[PDB]
Design an enzyme around this catalytic site. Structure first.
Site, short mmCIF file in Angstrom:
data_model
loop_
_atom_site.label_atom_id
_atom_site.label_comp_id
_atom_site.label_asym_id
_atom_site.label_seq_id
_atom_site.Cartn_x
_atom_site.Cartn_y
_atom_site.Cartn_z
N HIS B 157 43.16 42.31 40.33
CA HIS B 157 42.20 43.30 40.81
C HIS B 157 41.01 43.41 39.88
CE1 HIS B 157 45.68 44.97 43.15
NE2 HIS B 157 44.71 45.16 44.02
N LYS B 161 40.29 48.83 37.88
CA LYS B 161 41.61 49.42 38.22
C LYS B 161 42.32 49.92 36.98
CE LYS B 161 45.59 48.80 41.32
NZ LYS B 161 45.32 50.09 42.05
#
Ligand SMILES: NC(=O)C1=CN([C@@H]2O[C@H](COP(=O)(O)OP(=O)(O)OC[C@H]3O[C@@H](n4cnc5c(N)ncnc54)[C@H](O)[C@@H]3O)[C@@H](O)[C@H]2O)C=CC1
Ligand SMILES: NC(=O)C1=CN([C@@H]2O[C@H](COP(=O)(O)OP(=O)(O)OC[C@H]3O[C@@H](n4cnc5c(N)ncnc54)[C@H](O)[C@@H]3O)[C@@H](O)[C@H]2O)C=CC1
Ligand SMILES: NC(=O)C1=CN([C@@H]2O[C@H](COP(=O)(O)OP(=O)(O)OC[C@H]3O[C@@H](n4cnc5c(N)ncnc54)[C@H](O)[C@@H]3O)[C@@H](O)[C@H]2O)C=CC1
Ligand SMILES: O=C(O)c1cccc(C(=O)O)n1
Ligand SMILES: O=C(O)c1cccc(C(=O)O)n1
Ligand SMILES: O=C(O)c1cccc(C(=O)O)n1
Ligand SMILES: [K+]
Ligand SMILES: [K+]
EC number: 1.17.1.8
Lengths: 270, 271, 271, 269
Positions: B157, B161
């Site tokens: 990600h 994040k």
């Protein structure tokens, strides 16, 4: 073929492979094949041991015996053994490709000496691909290193016991040093729980351990909008063999020396 | 004639901006409210202009009751702590929730679990179709190959994040674990650093990549000697989760109480 | 902002909408013009609404001369035929140019080649940094491993692309080919269908995937027995080519005449 | 005790199949075969498959060993395989076919022969792929309609049929889960100016390079997301053990043609 090799420990997996390489690689000839004395497989015509056999080569076990038979010794066995084959090759000016790995400070410092007397070549990794990648990395990190996020992902069969792979770390280093920084400073090995934000300039590692994976490594340069991924995949342990043979052949023209794949592959001018 | 109104928690965040325009451009839904923290340099900002789609008339504000009659369903994609109150309040006053926030500790998970008693919640770790489908295909695979293969989960990600591994990853872990009569807590391995042993057979490991603008890439791996199966999902734009959460909100039409998830919504409780 | 006006061919297309907001938001650059097809349902509209937000002082149209004094550099990301026209214009009229359109037949490629005689063009198959860097790294790899390995090139693009393979792929092909003293025309293989023989040595094959909203994924593969090196680039957003092309126009500026690509722009030719 | 005939014992699958059978309790290396005047037609089937020795030797005749096996394992080429059928039928012999690249007609012949003899005809003999093959139906079911479907496969430099028979099998799996026939929507080549990908299609991309045992990817692409199911075979041994246990399990059936699915028992989800 205008040159003879000398696959030590010829009967093992490495040796066998090494033998194959010996055959295939245009330009080298299988001058010899050694093995532990009294091993049943002493005597078989090397080639036979590894698939196609026609070889006029019979697996011996006497160093001095074969003195004549080769031009260069390809050693990928355990240390001590290696150390010894070395003093021999040095005493006789025979030339070696040292696939062996695990020396103490006096082993490497030993191989150092031998060097002046003879043309040694010594690498931690005989994969062409890998060595190449390692280089390409410097190049990338150079241009995109500064602003992109760098992550390194590796995967290896279920039995590997060190994390991350030594090759991964080597990749880490390659990059780190192309960017005037030291890996110890910006390495992140684990991401678990509430981490927070990917810290700018850090290099992260992800380690997969599963099945029979010989070895897969990925270098990732991520920016917003695009990312470059350099990846190496080893399918068989042959890779290294091919490396050592090529390496071995490379030596065809030298007296003394100590090298590694960069030299062989001729990569600093790349 | 008309249709439902939606409260959009943390409207500033990247999911907020997606959710907002999401609700705007979709039939059956009127942008009920927009919310934000107190320090937000944007309370009172017009909703739609915040998200590009012009002025709407809805204004971010830091209060539940201040807009308590402005929506029917509360769509939450903030952070656990925050979501908790949204949780609490929404209960008292009883409005249907749709939670996509991740990183809940086992306790919070319980609270949601409780609240479902009277209000309806759609709590999912991922609001895309693909992932949900995958989530199912996993059960099937683990079923057959689970026992003897090595199971690893890799997710990646964008740099921002903050929870590792992805809540989706964990959902995948769970899917597999339960298809094999075992509990993830037992066999999860999150970190591999320094000389570890051989892969303690049976485990399910995770590898976490964090880099760039990666929306979301997840891979489920079933490795055997000689072959391996990899199931992989890749999210190209945040809009997919948005449309996912909205239509969920929609699904809640007529729902009095209880806890559901994407598979329920899309209806995939086994194909 | 300061200086340079830019004509934006086919302002309707996905690259147009990117290019426009690119020029607007980028310092040193002013949205010179906007253009379009002969009967585009888009004529007579103000550039800033199509792509972007906030009406401005430029409105689209179907004529070169109609705006012939409204720009300095012509940015083309349309289709070959179209682009060809523009090219004469910009040449007879001493205008700089920045072409990112792909799919040119060897002849069109010559015209561009010709026009460069008096005007400056920046003709590239890809306007991102990554790809250009890759393009270089390729030379390096092909150098060492080119001779004995099998080389394959795989590219994937959204469902709408109409030229196969990607112009970028070809560029990669060329990069490799020339690093190995050979010409791509000799060893290219575009299709593998039905029974066929052993992979003819020294051939550079191409596999083309076309699906969904894929911005752009390209992979260079150097395969040997026992190992393979794969270099891969992935574009997540069209904005990268936009900033690329804008920077180009700013660069072109001044050059009285010349033929170049992003490598010249980015100054990579000596990496 | 199930003696096995191993067609084309020289080939890479032969050498695998052979040691596979040797290694397995229950089947005994029945015979070994090869092509008209094989460079090594004859010698110890043992030596052939890796260093050492076994009672066996290889030859160019069916009847010459016609009583030396029960199940015929074929992993050669279609034409070759064709003949071995009727023979492996007339003389009531159980077959296990892993050869690929059959034209619709040959496929019919196999289809016919199953009438009295039992065949296990599969395009892939690994577990993974078979499972995948199933998962595919599931996916295509849900996302098939609106997504773009593409299939990518890659195999070592020597493969001669494109695309891989496994790929086509994947194609079929999907196609039939969507009430359509692959012949209708298959696209094998994308070269030059070709318009927007045609909506209904399933495309194929084929990579041929190096020693790639086999890599296959099924892709379901939508705007905003895509699902990729991928199988990777690391060693030919997996198909070998697959075929052997096929044959093995195939003992006793009166007749019928069968896919690796049945053997594996997956037909039921
Ligand atoms: N289920 C799904 O499809 C998805 C779930 N998520 C999860 O949803 C959350 C969203 O993060 P992003 O969308 O990137 O947004 P973000 O990371 O930009 O920040 C989230 C928003 O919630 C607000 N908020 C933060 N703390 C709050 C608090 N204590 N009380 C009330 N509001 C608060 C923030 O001000 C902002 O509006 C994360 O937990 C993420 O992991 C994210 C994407 C998709
Ligand atoms: N080098 C690079 O970085 C990139 C190159 N390209 C290439 O540039 C071109 C752009 O593709 P897209 O803009 O996405 O396509 P698109 O779907 O946006 O179509 C192009 C645009 O040009 C207009 N136009 C179309 N036909 C025209 C004609 N005959 N004469 C004049 N104007 C015309 C169309 O109305 C539309 O505005 C393609 O060849 C593409 O592959 C695309 C992206 C990046
Ligand atoms: N379904 C599965 O699990 C697998 C299927 N295959 C398929 O099986 C075939 C195998 O090719 P490879 O294994 O690479 O073999 P190969 O390329 O080494 O050639 C096969 C061997 O059989 C011999 N043979 C060839 N033609 C023959 C004929 N007409 N009649 C009788 N024997 C003949 C050849 O001399 C050689 O010894 C291909 O069609 C391949 O796609 C291969 C592996 C697994
Ligand atoms: O399951 C998750 O944690 C998840 C899923 C999608 C997006 C994000 C995110 O952008 O944080 N996080
Ligand atoms: O090389 C090309 O043809 C190319 C490169 C980037 C994007 C596109 C595109 O989206 O069509 N095409
Ligand atoms: O289905 C196939 O075509 C297939 C499957 C496994 C291996 C091979 C091969 O090595 O040719 N081909
Ligand atoms: K500007
Ligand atoms: K046996």
């Amino acid at each position: 073929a205008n040159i003879r090799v000398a696959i030590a420990g010829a009967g093992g997996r490495m040796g066998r492979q090494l033998i194959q390489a010996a055959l295939a690689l245009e330009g080298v000839q299988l001058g010899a094949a050694l093995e532990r004395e009294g091993s049943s497989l002493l005597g078989s015509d090397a080639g036979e041991l590894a698939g196609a056999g026609k070889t006029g080569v019979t697996v011996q076990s006497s160093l001095d015996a074969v003195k004549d038979d080769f031009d260069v010794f390809i050693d990928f066995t355990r240390p001590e053994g290696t150390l010894n084959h070395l003093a021999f090759c040095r005493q006789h000016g025979k030339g070696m490709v040292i696939g062996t790995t695990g020396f103490d400070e006096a082993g490497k410092q030993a191989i150092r000496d031998a060097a002046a007397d003879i043309a040694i070549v010594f690498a931690a990794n005989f994969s062409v691909g890998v060595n190449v990648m390692l280089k390409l990395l410097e190049k990338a990190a150079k241009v995109m290193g500064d602003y992109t996020d760098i992550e390194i992902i590796e995967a290896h069969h279920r039995h590997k016991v060190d994390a991350p792979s030594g090759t991964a770390l080597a990749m880490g280093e390659a990059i780190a040093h192309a960017l005037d920084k030291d890996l110890k400073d910006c390495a992140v090995y684990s991401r678990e729980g509430h981490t927070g934000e990917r810290v700018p300039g850090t290099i992260g590692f992800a380690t997969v351990r599963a099945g029979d994976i010989v070895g897969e490594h990925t270098a990732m340069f991520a920016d917003i909008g695009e990312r470059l991924e350099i990846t190496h995949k080893a399918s068989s342990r042959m890779t290294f063999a091919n490396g050592a043979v090529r390496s071995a052949l490379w030596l065809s023209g030298k007296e003394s020396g100590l090298f590694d794949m960069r030299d062989v592959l001729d990569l600093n001018n790349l």
